[PDB]
Amino acid sequence: ARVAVLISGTGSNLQALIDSTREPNSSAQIDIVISNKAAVAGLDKAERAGIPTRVINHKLYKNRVEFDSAIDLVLEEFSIDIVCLAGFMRILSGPFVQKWNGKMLNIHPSLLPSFKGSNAHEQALETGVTVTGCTVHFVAEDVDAGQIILQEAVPVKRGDTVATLSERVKLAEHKIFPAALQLVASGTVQLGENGKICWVK
Ligand SMILES: Nc1nc(=O)c2cc(CCCCc3ccc(C(=O)N[C@@H](CCC(=O)O)C(=O)O)s3)[nH]c2[nH]1
Ligand SMILES: NCC(=O)N[C@@H]1O[C@H](COP(=O)([O-])[O-])[C@@H](O)[C@H]1O
């Protein structure tokens, strides 16, 4: 399965995916990395790994649909099968989501359905949970509401900040995102007719 990874910053999840997809038994290969932000460290990581990169800024497009179409063009160019959102901090439009239904994965740093949105760690700390975690899910039109593939719980320590908590949760992210990509790319897991997750094996 040919994979595109979309990023907006540091790219630690990208690096974990690059590492995993180069294992001999990997069913996925990363053929393109796309960023909406220029000069971010995730681009350096891709380049260093010998993977092509494309930057697409919102300032060159009228609306969200034309922005996504520019993404889609590149996806089609590289004959992509699966899209991974790895620190990609943009909402995707309906038709784009619909086109890639069952083919697009996102990593989110909470145990969904808790703490949806762009500041999950802030929410978890504000709420005072002692257990948080991360979630890989299929992307549906409603944000962070798509079908869940894998999750991993991560403890919150007293005195945790966004800095220390996100560091701990990222170690879990780097485990389940490669595991989830491998499940989907090997055809072991799929979105299924009724919409709910289907373990084909
Ligand atoms: N259709 C859809 N379903 C999803 O399940 C899903 C997950 C993501 C992944 C992202 C979800 C977290 C985010 C929530 C809100 C954000 C936001 O408003 N981003 C700005 C970017 C501005 C900037 O920082 O430069 C924007 O969209 O314009 S980012 N994107 C998705 N889109
Ligand atoms: N809602 C999306 C979201 O909050 N994504 C989060 O952004 C970080 C990106 O780190 P990275 O650039 O080092 O992979 C990750 O922690 C990811 O879970």
Curated annotation (Swiss-Prot):
Active-site residues (renumbered): H108 (proton donor)
Site (Raises pKa of active site His): D144
Region (GART domain): 3-201
Domain statement: The N-terminal ATP-grasp domain carries the phosphoribosylamine--glycine ligase activity. The central AIRS domain carries the phosphoribosylformylglycinamidine cyclo-ligase activity.
Ligand binding ((6R)-10-formyltetrahydrofolate): R64, M89, R90, I91, L92, N106, A140, E141, D142, V143, D144
Quaternary data: Homodimer.
Name recorded for this polypeptide: Trifunctional purine biosynthetic protein adenosine-3
Gene (name only): GART
Included range, full protein: 808 to 1008 of 1010
Organism of this sequence: Homo sapiens
